[PDB]
Design a protein around this nucleic acid. Sequence first.
RNA 1: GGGGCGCACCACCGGCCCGCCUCGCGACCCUCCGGGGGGCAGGUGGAGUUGGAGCGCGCGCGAUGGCACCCGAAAGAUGGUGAACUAUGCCUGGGCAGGGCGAAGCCAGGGGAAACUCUGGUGGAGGCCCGCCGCGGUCCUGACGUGCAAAUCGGUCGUCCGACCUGGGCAUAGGGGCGAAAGACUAAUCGAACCAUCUAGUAGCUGGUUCCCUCCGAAGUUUCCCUCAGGAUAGCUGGCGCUCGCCGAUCAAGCAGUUUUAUCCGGUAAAGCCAAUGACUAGAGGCACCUAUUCUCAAACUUUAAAUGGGUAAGAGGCCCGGCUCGCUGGCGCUGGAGCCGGGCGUGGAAUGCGACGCGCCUAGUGGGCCAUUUUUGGUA
RNA 2: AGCAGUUGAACAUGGGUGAGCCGGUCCUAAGGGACGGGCCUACGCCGUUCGGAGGGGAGGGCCC
RNA 3: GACGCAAACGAACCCGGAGAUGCCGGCGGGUGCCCCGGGAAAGAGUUCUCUUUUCUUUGUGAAGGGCAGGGCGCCCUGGAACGGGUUCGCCCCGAGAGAGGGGCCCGCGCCCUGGAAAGCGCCGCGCUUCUGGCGGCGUCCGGUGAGCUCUCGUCGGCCCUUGAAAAUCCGGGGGAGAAGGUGUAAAUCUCGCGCCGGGCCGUACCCAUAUCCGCAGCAGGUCUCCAAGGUGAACAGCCUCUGGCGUGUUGGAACAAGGCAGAGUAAGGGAAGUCGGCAAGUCAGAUCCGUAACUUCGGGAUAAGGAUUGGCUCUAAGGGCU
RNA 4: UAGCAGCCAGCUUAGAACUGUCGCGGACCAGGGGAAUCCGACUGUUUAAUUAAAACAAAGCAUCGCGAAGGCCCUCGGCGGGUGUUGACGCGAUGUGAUUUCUGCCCAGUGCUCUGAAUGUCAAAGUGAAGAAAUUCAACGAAGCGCGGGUAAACGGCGGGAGUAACUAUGACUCUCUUAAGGUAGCCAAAUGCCUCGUCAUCUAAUUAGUGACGCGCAUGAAUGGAUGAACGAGAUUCCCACUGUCCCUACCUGCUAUCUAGCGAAACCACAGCCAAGGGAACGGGCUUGGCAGAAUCAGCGGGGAAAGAAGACCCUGUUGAGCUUGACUCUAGUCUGGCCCUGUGAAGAGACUUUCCUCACUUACCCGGUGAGGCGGGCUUCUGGCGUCAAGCGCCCCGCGGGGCGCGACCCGCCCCGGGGACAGCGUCAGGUGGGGAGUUUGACUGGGGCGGUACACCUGUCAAACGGUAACGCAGGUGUCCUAAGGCGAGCUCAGGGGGGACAGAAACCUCCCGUAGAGCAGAAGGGCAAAAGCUCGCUUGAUCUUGAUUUUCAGUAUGAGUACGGACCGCGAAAGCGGGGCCUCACGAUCCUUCCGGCUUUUGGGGUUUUAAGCGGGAGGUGUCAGAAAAGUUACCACAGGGAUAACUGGCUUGUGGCGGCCAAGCGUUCAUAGCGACGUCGCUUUUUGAUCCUUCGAUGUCGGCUCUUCCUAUCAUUGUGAAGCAGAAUUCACCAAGCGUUGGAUUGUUCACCCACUAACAGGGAACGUGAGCUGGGUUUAGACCGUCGUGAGACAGGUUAGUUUUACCCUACUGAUGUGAGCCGUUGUUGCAAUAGUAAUCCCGCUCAGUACGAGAGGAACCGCGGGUUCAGACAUUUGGUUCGUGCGCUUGGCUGAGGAGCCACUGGCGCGAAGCCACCAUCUGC
Length: 245
Amino acid sequence: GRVIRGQRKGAGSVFKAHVKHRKGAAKLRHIDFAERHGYIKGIVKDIIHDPGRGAPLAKVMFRDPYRFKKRTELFIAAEGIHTGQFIYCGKKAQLNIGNVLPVGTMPEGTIVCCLEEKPGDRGKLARASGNYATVISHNPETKKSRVKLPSGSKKVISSANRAVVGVVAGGGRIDKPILKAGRAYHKYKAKRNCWPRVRGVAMNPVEHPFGGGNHQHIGKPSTIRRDAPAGRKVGLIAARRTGRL
RNA sequence: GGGGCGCACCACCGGCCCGCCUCGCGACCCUCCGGGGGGCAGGUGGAGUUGGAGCGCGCGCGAUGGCACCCGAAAGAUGGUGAACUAUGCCUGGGCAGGGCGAAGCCAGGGGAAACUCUGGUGGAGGCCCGCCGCGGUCCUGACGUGCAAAUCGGUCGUCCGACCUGGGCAUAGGGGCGAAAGACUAAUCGAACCAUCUAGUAGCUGGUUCCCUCCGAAGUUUCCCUCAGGAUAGCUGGCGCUCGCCGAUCAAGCAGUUUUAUCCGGUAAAGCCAAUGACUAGAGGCACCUAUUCUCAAACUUUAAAUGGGUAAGAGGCCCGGCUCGCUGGCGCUGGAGCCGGGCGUGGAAUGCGACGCGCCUAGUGGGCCAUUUUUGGUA
RNA sequence: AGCAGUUGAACAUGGGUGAGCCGGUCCUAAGGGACGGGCCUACGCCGUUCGGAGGGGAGGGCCC
RNA sequence: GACGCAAACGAACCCGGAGAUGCCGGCGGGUGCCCCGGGAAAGAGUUCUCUUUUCUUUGUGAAGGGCAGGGCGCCCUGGAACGGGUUCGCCCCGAGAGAGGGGCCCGCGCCCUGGAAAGCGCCGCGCUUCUGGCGGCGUCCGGUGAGCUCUCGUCGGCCCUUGAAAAUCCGGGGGAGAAGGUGUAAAUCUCGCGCCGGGCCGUACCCAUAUCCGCAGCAGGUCUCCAAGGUGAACAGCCUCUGGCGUGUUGGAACAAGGCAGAGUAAGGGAAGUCGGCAAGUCAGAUCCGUAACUUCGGGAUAAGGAUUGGCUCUAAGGGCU
RNA sequence: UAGCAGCCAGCUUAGAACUGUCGCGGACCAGGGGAAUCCGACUGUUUAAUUAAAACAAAGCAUCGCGAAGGCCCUCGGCGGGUGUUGACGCGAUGUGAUUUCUGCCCAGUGCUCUGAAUGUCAAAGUGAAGAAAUUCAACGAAGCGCGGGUAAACGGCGGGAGUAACUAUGACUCUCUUAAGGUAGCCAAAUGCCUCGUCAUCUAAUUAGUGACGCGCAUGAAUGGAUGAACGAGAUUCCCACUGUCCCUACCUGCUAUCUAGCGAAACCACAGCCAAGGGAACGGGCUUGGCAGAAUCAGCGGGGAAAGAAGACCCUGUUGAGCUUGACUCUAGUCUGGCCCUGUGAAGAGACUUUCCUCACUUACCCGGUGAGGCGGGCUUCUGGCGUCAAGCGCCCCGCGGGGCGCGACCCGCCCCGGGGACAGCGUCAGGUGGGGAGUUUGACUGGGGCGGUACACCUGUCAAACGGUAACGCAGGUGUCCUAAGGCGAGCUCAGGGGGGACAGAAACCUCCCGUAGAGCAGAAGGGCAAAAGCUCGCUUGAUCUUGAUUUUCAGUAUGAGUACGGACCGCGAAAGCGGGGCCUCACGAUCCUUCCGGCUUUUGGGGUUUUAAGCGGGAGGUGUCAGAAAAGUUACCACAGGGAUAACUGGCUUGUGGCGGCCAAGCGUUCAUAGCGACGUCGCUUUUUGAUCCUUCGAUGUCGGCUCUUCCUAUCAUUGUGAAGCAGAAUUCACCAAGCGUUGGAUUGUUCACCCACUAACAGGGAACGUGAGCUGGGUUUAGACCGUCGUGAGACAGGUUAGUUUUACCCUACUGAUGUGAGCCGUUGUUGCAAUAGUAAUCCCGCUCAGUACGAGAGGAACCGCGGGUUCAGACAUUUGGUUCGUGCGCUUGGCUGAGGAGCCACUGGCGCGAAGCCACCAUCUGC
Ligand SMILES: [Mg+2]
Ligand SMILES: [Mg+2]
Ligand SMILES: [Mg+2]
Ligand SMILES: [Mg+2]
Ligand SMILES: [Mg+2]
Ligand SMILES: [Mg+2]
Ligand SMILES: [Mg+2]
Ligand SMILES: [Mg+2]
Ligand SMILES: [Mg+2]
Ligand SMILES: [Mg+2]
Ligand SMILES: [Mg+2]
Ligand SMILES: [Mg+2]
Ligand SMILES: [Mg+2]
Ligand SMILES: [Mg+2]
Ligand SMILES: [Mg+2]
Ligand SMILES: [Mg+2]
Ligand SMILES: [Mg+2]
Ligand SMILES: [Mg+2]
Ligand SMILES: [Mg+2]
Ligand SMILES: [Mg+2]
Ligand SMILES: [Mg+2]
Ligand SMILES: [Mg+2]
Ligand SMILES: [Mg+2]
Ligand SMILES: [Mg+2]
Ligand SMILES: [Mg+2]
Ligand SMILES: [Mg+2]
Ligand SMILES: [Mg+2]
Ligand SMILES: [Mg+2]
Ligand SMILES: [Mg+2]
Ligand SMILES: [Mg+2]
Ligand SMILES: [Mg+2]
Ligand SMILES: [Mg+2]
Ligand SMILES: [Mg+2]
Ligand SMILES: [Mg+2]
Ligand SMILES: [Mg+2]
Ligand SMILES: [Mg+2]
Ligand SMILES: [Mg+2]
Ligand SMILES: [Mg+2]
Ligand SMILES: [Mg+2]
Ligand SMILES: [Mg+2]
Ligand SMILES: [Mg+2]
Ligand SMILES: [Mg+2]
Ligand SMILES: [Mg+2]
Ligand SMILES: [Mg+2]
Ligand SMILES: [Mg+2]
Ligand SMILES: [Mg+2]
Ligand SMILES: [Mg+2]
Ligand SMILES: [Mg+2]
Ligand SMILES: [Mg+2]
Ligand SMILES: [Mg+2]
Ligand SMILES: [Mg+2]
Ligand SMILES: [Mg+2]
Ligand SMILES: [Mg+2]
Ligand SMILES: [Mg+2]
Ligand SMILES: [Mg+2]
Ligand SMILES: [Mg+2]
Ligand SMILES: [Mg+2]
Ligand SMILES: [Mg+2]
Ligand SMILES: [Mg+2]
Ligand SMILES: [Mg+2]
Ligand SMILES: [Mg+2]
Ligand SMILES: [Mg+2]
Ligand SMILES: [Mg+2]
Ligand SMILES: [Mg+2]
Ligand SMILES: [Mg+2]
Ligand SMILES: [Mg+2]
Ligand SMILES: [Mg+2]
Ligand SMILES: [Mg+2]
Ligand SMILES: [Mg+2]
Ligand SMILES: [Mg+2]
Ligand SMILES: [Mg+2]
Ligand SMILES: [Mg+2]
Ligand SMILES: [Mg+2]
Ligand SMILES: [Mg+2]
Ligand SMILES: [Mg+2]
Ligand SMILES: [Mg+2]
Ligand SMILES: [Mg+2]
Ligand SMILES: [Mg+2]
Ligand SMILES: [Mg+2]
Ligand SMILES: [Mg+2]
Ligand SMILES: [Mg+2]
Ligand SMILES: [Mg+2]
Ligand SMILES: [Mg+2]
Ligand SMILES: [Mg+2]
Ligand SMILES: [Mg+2]
Ligand SMILES: [Mg+2]
Ligand SMILES: [Mg+2]
Ligand SMILES: [Mg+2]
Ligand SMILES: [Mg+2]
Ligand SMILES: [Mg+2]
Ligand SMILES: [Mg+2]
Ligand SMILES: [Mg+2]
């Protein structure tokens, strides 16, 4: 047979991202002496819509401490901020919405967003619209903390990872039901070439391990092992259980 | 008319060499420690030996390896070239009459005790409707069907503000691409493109295989084979000879799809079942059986038993006589037996026919058969 | 030039395209593709704003 | 005061603007085209009868100066409820309406320089390869429109769609520096004008029922711009003017059969034809009435089912300006 | 002041009068409608060149993986690349397919997944012991497998049999079997129901259709989604209204062709060619045989034939030919998981032995990741606002000409890595084990009354077939075998069996004792045949001839091997007093090459430059086995299919055959009230026919187009009707049987694709067939019979269905005959030319019914009820014809009229015939009329 549609997505020919009209990479300010021993003042200039995601981005303009220049940072717009307000990033920053203070200096039960996995990566966890991570507990002995990622998994990260307080804007976006296939067409036309998903049973055995047969049955257990080769690993990969639940 | 040496060659019997087995176990001069021999004889295996025949070259033919008598596959592999068509994505541009229903919002007038309602107008929403260009291609299964056209033409028809149509520039390249998924599309080529090469790929399979005359002349059957459209093998065929007889039974002869004479073999036709095994009808006698009878049968039953047919014997390789040899045999140097040697005896001791279809070598084709008289199996035929 | 022709996109002999202000040239879009580095036995390939001691213009008379 | 004056020094560095933003809808300003009124001028057409008739032609470039017109969450005064202003729709106001007076932007419209000398229209004379030249007159006065396009604005609508980069150019912040000491100097965003230069390549023609592709002068295929009068809702169909053409690789004479097509027509019956109402036949625009079962209350729906429609002569209603 | 005057400007709406032939969206433009069923929600998309659909997509719903050292995926490769300018409201992988309403039971099987070294199996490396060593042995022992748990919106699955309620019936209720659960809610003869044209109702004069119901449903059923559904559809289906040449039943007109002509001018095709009947033949000739017969050269048609052209059949079989694809095929592989070694160093703690192994925690410098313009690391001064922040003001000190310059503090000092996060773990290199249709290569026996399924007739044995030597075939017949036996082998001795009769306590038809008869009629391991009585059977006691060896030889045979046998020679033995017998079974069957492994044997060989010892090799003989049995290591599918071929071989016709089907006789038990034969014919039996279906496989696979209908012609008779007759259980009428006889006619419809059926009416009757199951270059494609798709059942799957359902290119004649018409042709010319005729021969045509009268008569008890002659019409058919009626009308004849055009009137034109009304002439219709012996 030939290669399945899933194998062709790794080549990156027509399945690359559509990043022409995107406004940049949303990431926190790189950690420097100002964010380690104090705080830096920044002004929110504009809240723009990034084509491809459901969460707005804020263009916060800080002041460079070593040269006469004003840096522009493209943050994740936490729900509640507005243009013209001041955002303070650093250790000594107060516990307000929008500020970027390390998780080690936050009380237990804080709602953060754009959390950092490791110190310096400029914000990875809890970055989609309406999502957040809660700080569960601290540990001054091992300099570690425990946060609750939006997937429900409790991850143990360092106490120096910075995060934006407050939930991400654009919450409740998945509540409005898409009514037309055209709204789903324009939804993915800005993300990537992945929308029309042809079922494996609707294909021939050459293109998919589920195709073929005078009926449209699967014919084999859809639950597939994890060590299955690329080309066979379709359906339910390493399914611990199935059913309605 | 008699005798003899006998070529080549054939049949048979011996000698010797090598392997192996068995019996002799060892006295004896080859031993210098170690050792080597000890006619060993009797069977047996060998592509041996007992007075070489090979080598070289040339020619003919046959079976092989090779492109291999010529033309032909569907495929496989290596290396390249294509997204001017088409599929999807990206960048940047262009384009889509005229009408219809008419949503939120708003204004006004009425009803209310509040909750809130009713009428008109406004507004111009929509993968909304009729519909032109566009873009598609339903039906007539129309036209055309060596056409205008290697897919077109006419009427009709789908859609036409959205998942729309479209140009250019870019991206993905062959077991790869791409696919709102038809195994579709990827330059008229796609259930794996095109170009060149390996490649004159292989074919037990179709087709063809070129001058004349003379002579001989088949096989579709046996055995083995992942064989049953093919091979191997035997048979049938041809060629080259060769050993003789040629002289006729001057000669030995021998042979025969034939008879005669003589002697054996068989269990089919017929016959039998009142004889056995098995099947079977009917009375009668004696106290369901029992006896003597009776009707009807056998391919896997038979007492008996043909016709046709099969084998063998019809002479010198015989017949007869004498002597000798033996470890075999044993009352019995002959007790058998067999071998060896010598001598005596043609009226070649049935008919007919014929040179021996004698001794070898090489060998093509064939290995699908079909029909008839009689015999006969399966089948209604 | 599927009949013809005194005709032609045929044949023969000559002639014809003039730019500071039309466009190319210039810019980067998708994208292609060097450099550093890595990789490949190799021809070469991967990768593209990241990565090398990657700065050869500007100013004050020798500084930056 | 918005901001205006011909100019009106200024580095490093910084900040910002323009380049540079979608689709759709409504409205308004301006051109082009069309139309109407001159009982307008110059030629032509018609005249059998009528026709002060019918047809054609009546002009201004870029750039600059001025002025209409359009736009503005631009300024000052002032202060709002009996709330007012205002659009087709909206929208606006104590974070300051209405009103009064100003500022700026766009002006592709009009006047002027250009510029009538030229261009068209008409008339006359000279001339027949210098001839293939010289003269005369005219180029006018208004109107609007649910008209059609283009364009500039403006207010909205839609998105789980937010609808490009860079060269290049400009403004501001910044005040490092430079200029002369009593008439000039530094510096000038020409600030009025003058001087010099602008190389290289493409440029003809066809652009499709005969210059491209499909073996061809192939009923196929191939990206765009301009686009008139009448009927009509229409860029539909039919007819006409500008422009183009000879009927699409041939003429002539016949009008048999049989075909293709005209979606030709038909007595009485009306699907009895046929696998099957295949085929084509009925219906069709618009106005006024009237519209069920069912339903997700959106629809069904142009449901179904009726009436009216020409021509001509009138009447009534719907405007603007002084 | 309930506003007026003047002037200007268009374009619409409403009402009314009048008027033309009731014509007016007048041309043009331009929805037929209604009641329901099936499927898909809708818009969209799709097989460029046969399938536009119910298929794909879709929103909605649900499951699955993954927190970045990650999920998914790419690359030969860089810890390179895609999702990712991403971060669970995200990305990746699947099923379902809107909304409404629901989504039941089963975790045994397969698959996924979790648990765990707490017990089996378990590689490389390492560790231990023996040994000169190679080597052998033992312990240890990862993932995976095994054990256990979970999971079905994972693949999937979801049963049988009796009794029983006051007639009958049903079986609530019980009984039994049985699982892993035994189909729940629903729905249905459904696109799913073989039987089947189910049954009832409805729809029609009539319905295999449609719809509503019924449900033990071959084989419905719940996200392999069930039920329903407004709107929507170039989807499938039924009925109704309107409409119409679809039809009854065809006719007429027009344009472009065909036709003729000037010019121009091909191609497919072609063995030679072209009249038929029959015969034979390779079983359907054009040519051959026997007959019919046969006259130049051509035009327009035509579709009977040339088993016409197009194309080495696509179906079928064969090939030791392929390809696509799928798995539980065979053999491998990328990837992935796992362990040892490696870069890999350092410090410490604990527990088993005496420098150490296991595990854990730490060190940073190897290694790895992240951040930045490597901007403040380690050790002793900004939170009230959508301002501003740029190379230092100041102080100290120094150097030059009031003008310049430089330095330090401001801006603390020291340092070893830029700062963080891991860290000798990730990772890399290399072996090892597991997983691995993701991918690669290949295989997937043969025989065979086609192949497949079945069978083994594939290696063997008995009787028969087999025709009296031997041999002799078929998917001939009746059978048997892949074993059994330390005795059932060998030998010696003794004994006599099967059965029957007479007897004998319990004891009987069967126990045991005994006498008599007993040719074997018993037994001999098995199938059968043969053989056997002091045996070969039975019993008993001694035994290992069931051993070791060379050759000869029989049988299958090629006269090869193996297997199975026979007779001897040489050893060593058994039994017997002995002669003798015995190297397996009473005989015919019971079995296996090369290579390799293994064991036994040597009075032995090599291990090579010698010697010694291990090891290995070799010679001789067994065993391990190839049952496809002279011996490959091997699962499917293909309807997406390809190639080489095959009429060696199936599906059509034809041919032979006629079981079967159909049809007709013979005999006469009996039926017929009585009477065998008016009409029938049981038990038997003899034939015909090729309109049934088989059997066969001769023709055809470098192709004979294939089911039905439509259309049209002709023949046959085994006669339904009509004509002429015979017979009766013929009174009449009606009907039945039979004869001469195919001249003539044999219908319109509902349902079904149907031939075949069934019903509705009509009728003199509505007979049965043939002609390549007549007839596709005649048509129609409904059916079947490619590719799309749906369901049911089956398969793990790809896929299958002789089951259902929907959409699916029907090509060419101009050649030669045949036929239909149209010119012309004997040419030999005193013949040329014309008129009027004759006639061979060929075709041939009429058919049937009704009404009146006979007649209410014959006849009959009645009820009922004819016929001939004559008269008047009609059905079907045939040949004509246009006076009349009707159709057509581009005499474009006349009138009218829509839009536009010529300035208007008048007169006209344009819109491929603008439209409408009427319409001459022609042509035309059982739609008018006339004739038919
Ligand atoms: Mg499919
Ligand atoms: Mg499948
Ligand atoms: Mg499905
Ligand atoms: Mg299944
Ligand atoms: Mg191969
Ligand atoms: Mg656009
Ligand atoms: Mg509608
Ligand atoms: Mg259209
Ligand atoms: Mg298409
Ligand atoms: Mg078409
Ligand atoms: Mg057609
Ligand atoms: Mg034709
Ligand atoms: Mg394009
Ligand atoms: Mg690749
Ligand atoms: Mg598509
Ligand atoms: Mg398919
Ligand atoms: Mg496609
Ligand atoms: Mg002799
Ligand atoms: Mg053979
Ligand atoms: Mg041979
Ligand atoms: Mg010519
Ligand atoms: Mg010329
Ligand atoms: Mg030329
Ligand atoms: Mg732009
Ligand atoms: Mg733009
Ligand atoms: Mg606008
Ligand atoms: Mg104001
Ligand atoms: Mg400035
Ligand atoms: Mg030009
Ligand atoms: Mg032309
Ligand atoms: Mg005609
Ligand atoms: Mg016609
Ligand atoms: Mg009619
Ligand atoms: Mg009919
Ligand atoms: Mg009908
Ligand atoms: Mg139709
Ligand atoms: Mg309706
Ligand atoms: Mg239903
Ligand atoms: Mg239906
Ligand atoms: Mg649909
Ligand atoms: Mg198609
Ligand atoms: Mg699922
Ligand atoms: Mg579906
Ligand atoms: Mg379920
Ligand atoms: Mg399970
Ligand atoms: Mg030693
Ligand atoms: Mg049920
Ligand atoms: Mg019907
Ligand atoms: Mg029903
Ligand atoms: Mg079921
Ligand atoms: Mg089921
Ligand atoms: Mg189902
Ligand atoms: Mg519609
Ligand atoms: Mg449709
Ligand atoms: Mg429909
Ligand atoms: Mg549609
Ligand atoms: Mg012939
Ligand atoms: Mg043919
Ligand atoms: Mg062939
Ligand atoms: Mg073979
Ligand atoms: Mg293939
Ligand atoms: Mg495979
Ligand atoms: Mg293969
Ligand atoms: Mg076979
Ligand atoms: Mg055989
Ligand atoms: Mg057997
Ligand atoms: Mg014989
Ligand atoms: Mg012996
Ligand atoms: Mg017969
Ligand atoms: Mg019969
Ligand atoms: Mg009787
Ligand atoms: Mg009789
Ligand atoms: Mg009978
Ligand atoms: Mg029949
Ligand atoms: Mg045959
Ligand atoms: Mg007769
Ligand atoms: Mg009779
Ligand atoms: Mg027949
Ligand atoms: Mg036929
Ligand atoms: Mg045909
Ligand atoms: Mg037919
Ligand atoms: Mg025919
Ligand atoms: Mg069909
Ligand atoms: Mg059918
Ligand atoms: Mg099909
Ligand atoms: Mg079927
Ligand atoms: Mg009477
Ligand atoms: Mg008439
Ligand atoms: Mg008119
Ligand atoms: Mg026209
Ligand atoms: Mg017309
Ligand atoms: Mg008329």
